[PDB]
Amino acid sequence: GQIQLWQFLLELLSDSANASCITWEGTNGEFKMTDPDEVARRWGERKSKPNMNYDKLSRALRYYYDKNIMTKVHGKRYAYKFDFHGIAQALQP
């Protein structure tokens, strides 16, 4: 059904078989997209939106910064951090 981008990333992150494109790395919440192109592609497939690429995926994450769901780590690139404040709220109907 209707799965959301943040949920998709935790799905990918939940299995180290996906490490070639995405993996936890760092302290609580921190991950890196080892292949952002591949992560965008897989999302596009899942949400049957085959116009999806990395630029569009990066834009959609921007929405999540103001919701406190996650935040981009400035300085590093392709690095991000899930925040429990917003995730706990996003987890609610």
Give, in order, the Cα–Cα distances in Å from 33 to each of 8, 36, 89: 13, 5, 24
**For a second copy, which residue of 10, 25, 49, 63 counts as binding (CB under 8 A)?**
10
Dihedrals φ, ψ of 74, to 5°? -65, 150
Nearest to a second copy of 34, 53 (CB atom)? 34
Neighbours of 65 (CB within 10 A): 13
- Separation CA 17–CA 54 (nearest Å): 21
- Separation CA 18–CA 1 (nearest Å): 22
Nearest to a second copy of 55, 89 (CB atom)? 89
CB of 81: closest distance to a second copy in angstroms?
7
CB of 59: closest distance to Co ion in angstroms?
22
Per-residue x/- marks for Co ion, 33-72, CB under 5 A?
----------------------------------------
CB of 44: closest distance to a second copy in angstroms?
21
